[PDB]
Amino acid sequence: YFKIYSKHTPIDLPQGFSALEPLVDLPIGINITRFQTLLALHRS
Amino acid sequence: LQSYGFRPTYGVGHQPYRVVVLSFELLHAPATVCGPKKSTNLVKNKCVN
């Protein structure tokens, strides 16, 4: 199961406490050992 | 590859039949398709199971 918790709170990171709630529940079966990220470039 | 020459004035046993074979398997994924769970009414203020 691949779990994701998330929260979007409006305002180097600051200092405080905020608990994150479940977002999805995904019965995938997938194994993970590595990952990457994706960014939106500047072109115009 | 030969062809079936289906005409309506054939005999049963030479007429076309549509077949749908189903196949179930449970490889390793710990959830997927399963049928419906029925739910009855609901009472209140009673000791119930």
Ligand SMILES: *[C@@H]1O[C@H](CO)[C@@H](O)[C@H](O)[C@H]1NC(C)=O
């Ligand atoms: C994930 O990898 C392990 C070996 O590191 C393997 O034994 C296991 O079966 C894999 N899990 C799945 C769901 O394929």
